[model samples]
Target: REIEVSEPREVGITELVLRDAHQSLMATRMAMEDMVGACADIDAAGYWSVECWGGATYDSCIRFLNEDPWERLRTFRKLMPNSRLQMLLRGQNLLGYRHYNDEVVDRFVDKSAENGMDVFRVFDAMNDPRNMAHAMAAVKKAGKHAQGTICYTISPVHTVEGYVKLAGQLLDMGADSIALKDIAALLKPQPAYDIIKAIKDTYGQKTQINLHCHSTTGVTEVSLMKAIEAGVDVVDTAISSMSLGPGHNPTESVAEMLEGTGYTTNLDYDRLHKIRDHFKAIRPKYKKFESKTLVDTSIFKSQIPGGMLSNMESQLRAQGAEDKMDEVMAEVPRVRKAAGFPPLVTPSSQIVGTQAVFNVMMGEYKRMTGEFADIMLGYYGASPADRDPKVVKLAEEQSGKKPITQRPADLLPPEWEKQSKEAATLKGFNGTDEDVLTYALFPQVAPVFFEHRAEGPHSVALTDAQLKAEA
Candidate 1:
């Protein structure tokens, strides 16, 4: 048989080693010191973008590792001068747990762009376009790439048509590109092909779509192949040593798989190997924080993410009821449906998971988390399907709040001045808006981090000497 002839095409890659890789595999505990050595090779690797900041990194930096998140971005910028720096912004949340005022979102994007964040992959946990619109506009205002994301999930109300419509909304809001974020690795290969094809068909090839999927399900590498075949423009990946498990498809592996296909990735294997080697040495340092979610296809039925599973495990462990894990898992879908089937992602995942635990332990609806109540009361924005009416009534009664149909941020007043003033009064206030934004994002932890800013960034990872001594 002869080779099937095809027009040549290239797939761009966004390397995730500095951000999502460790975030997925080891709790976002890779300190700047551990990652800095790989930058030279990574910057030379010819990736479409380098995802080196954002996601849980901001909170992890301040709360756990004592590193200034802003300084981390600056370091990436300084080291990877040639690569585009991308961040995962939580839409109007601006790296925080809840929505901020539009002014705060604007300021965060401005400072982020000023400090070398080249692309903003903005997503709303509730899949609310309103939540993401202002942030996308702000990225556009800052002359940076605004990548509006569809938080891909499997649900009764989430469909290819639904996602395509969401893509249209993002494009209407001036998203430079669209990111299909399969954070739970829930996107299967055929659906991946169908969705990407539908998107490219509707929006045209000029509209770039990036596919981001975790490898936890052992199926997304095939999903990536389907996405590339369906004309996806970019994909996210980690280096070999840091890949698979709950991380991402290996960068080198993606490139190698495309060898015979008409599609090819532009990354350099030599530099990719070097970056992999650096992470190989660094990864074991954070072994204690690593989740036990190496590969679990059972997520197809449960729809609970690997990261969320790990979190619920630790939460149970802390409460001395680790045996109730199956009970909690069984309760998640019920809670998710009652809350309207929001995507299993940050903050929402925590909210839903904890509420499930409470439902299992205390009694169903006997106790509800404030966060779960918020989701039901519409504080987080619209879920994919309408929430259960009886549950809504229960939430209103339990939370002592009425339901809201308007955008959540519409209720928030301008808070920048208050944040700035309070931040300035902190012991180690650097007097920059970056510091102020940090305070705004995490008021609870900012003061402690600021007080210790003089000590410089410190890694929470076990030191090599400490490991050797234990040995």
Candidate 2:
């Protein structure tokens, strides 16, 4: 019944149409050409920042789209000169699947800043602050905005008090801001309000807080409002034409919603309209990759991502056990609990989902995945709670690896030179650190992307006429 609010102030917006929006809704398949046309309007729209790269886009660029990820950042810098270009760095992972040594993390952050990244939203899948410390410091060293993130998830161990503690740790590491990142749309309005309020209360009003929630559960739009009322500094949103479903709340919709609340976003509605229309035309080209459901609240019960669910389904279908869907779903939480309740995000989600299928299809912990074993062995940093000791022993016995309690990167030797040497042997080596970094991030895909680099980037999406013909 009560607003329980911050002072009437302008909440900043971080436009996600170029990165997470398409990544969430369309499997990270949106092409650079389609996105380039909207940059002018987006730049003029006065967003606090524009998230244009990192996350799966790096892999998507080289692995599928035949584009250089570094070049995409450069082009974004050129197109949107006035807007701050932001990126999502996976903490010590540094845009790759596994943890790289601190040397690699430093190099990656330096290169990202050099290549026009202005804001680094560094997060760890395990929500381990240790894994994020080096990356956050690197971002600050580069004099860029370092936004340390709390990966919002639901588990017995996750709580607002715990999140406030995490925010304190990030601030201790010198984060320029704190991001409440809820990739699964699990952040309900009440919890969202409570977390933001507690954080602002403890850290004071100057500590910038950003909220990034997916629209998957049809609840985060309300959560966004609650966050604003609790004094969130900035929020991420996609343009209306490219929003909702698993993507994000609409920029215009959020802006318009604040009309009578005395809260407002510092965005130009006219420029946003043009930006929305641009994506509206380009969206249909990638229709085949768009998520089918507009919203699914089932995640409240399951904590399973839509993509992860589909992946498990395909895995089961391949093995002729499509009926095991419910079985695998039940096994997921069990698998998660054994692994210490890591937030079900990329790599972790995939690892847990596949292993759950294996456990159900075979026997409980009969055959463990290498990644799952790694998680239990503490090679992916610590999970939210202590891993089941029996499961950890099983992982060790099966995999012939001992468990560790130190930061995962401590175990990794310096890998930059070795990667450079290996990458130099590729036919299309460009003789730059950026190219080396590319090869470093994606060894399998980089060689092919490099050899064919001269051919230039191409879209995998269908043309407008091609879509018509298919129709």
Candidate 3:
């Protein structure tokens, strides 16, 4: 007799964590009032857990968690005592390091715990040897729970071997739980599923497995499903209004998908939708960069890989192919088949995932000799110089640029300098390393900021110069 697994497994939403959004929104100088309002909104929406803090290391954490920010977070926590708030801890850099002394770690953990955090999400630079020992000591002292995170940024190859090694390391580190973090959407499903299955098979009863997917390549829901099928214990999600267009996975959709699954989520769907609508209303009020096609999850699922979404809209605008969005839509499925991935509409279907989708799209664009093919390819880290001459020629024929070089200095204007200075004053806005080169090389022209501001404020542009200066 065949053992039948129930359809739509019962999943619990009791431990949902609201992260990434706080980091991104705060970095962009979104008002503290707005941030606090969002937190209150999430709490009222009935999520049981939330990640209140995150950064690369203790120093970074401290920097991000300034007095004002913590005060706001504390107020939100008090308003919703039923929800558990969490904080992130990092060893050194994204790669991991022995940067923090024991005292530093102790204080960091203690402070967060004293502030009423329920869990400490910890990661090292490269899953280094000392990660667990360091993390355990801090969590033990704080008397708070600890969760391990595997960040998939530099590693494109999400192989079983790499995952097994990392999983083993995390288990050894005393991680009560594990989170698969694909910030860049680099981890493909087959490999990710294989790894999740192997890890669950080995330790399902001992530890909880949480999946964290970014919209970078648009396969977050797909990745989450694969992880769930493999017995992942938890999944991160935003709200339906925030669904996988240019940002985090929407909570309500994931909750709807996981309802009746054996796993449990503490998300209140009605409340979630309420918060979503509120966010949607507030979304247009912000002057920050917003994508026009963000709500088109159909495109996101079908043809637009997560990794390319950020740059694709701009690229399309530049190529004067704004009218050809439908054609681009038509090509997604064809590109997916060529790349050996299934179409996005299949609920449980596994394709090459987002990164491979990006690679395939690049290849297809080159093949079609589509206008802006070169620009599109560059979004995936490929350059005309990296491709064969024939490919370059094809791109030129389609896009009218044989080889796009760096923008000329004459493009810089005085407004750009004013904007740059204004932008640099914001909390996480570090001027690029080549700022000196930009100034020295383009003395006749105003700094590179002129050209950048001509379009609009770059990522770090000042939302309001006076306000930021006061900050």
Best by TM-score: 2
Whole-model alpha-carbon lDDT for candidate 3: 0.49
Global Cα RMSD, each model = 2.3, 1.2, 12.8
Measured with C-alpha atoms, the lDDT of residue 349 in candidate 3 is 16
Candidates 1 and 3, the one with greater lDDT: 1
Candidate 2 residue spans exceeding 4 A from truth: 1-3
Each prediction's Cα lDDT score?
Answer: 0.90, 0.92, 0.49
287-363, model 2: which lDDT tens digit per residue?
Answer: 88987888899888888887799989999999887898999999999999999999998888999999999999889
- Give TM per candidate: 0.95, 0.98, 0.57
Off by over 4 Å in 3: 1-18, 25-28, 38-41, 44-48, 56-67, 92-98, 153-158, 259-266, 291-471
Model 2 steric clash pairs: none
lDDT for position 378 in model 2:
92
Best model number under lDDT: 2
Ranking by lDDT: 2, 1, 3
Sort by TM-score, top down from the best: 2, 1, 3
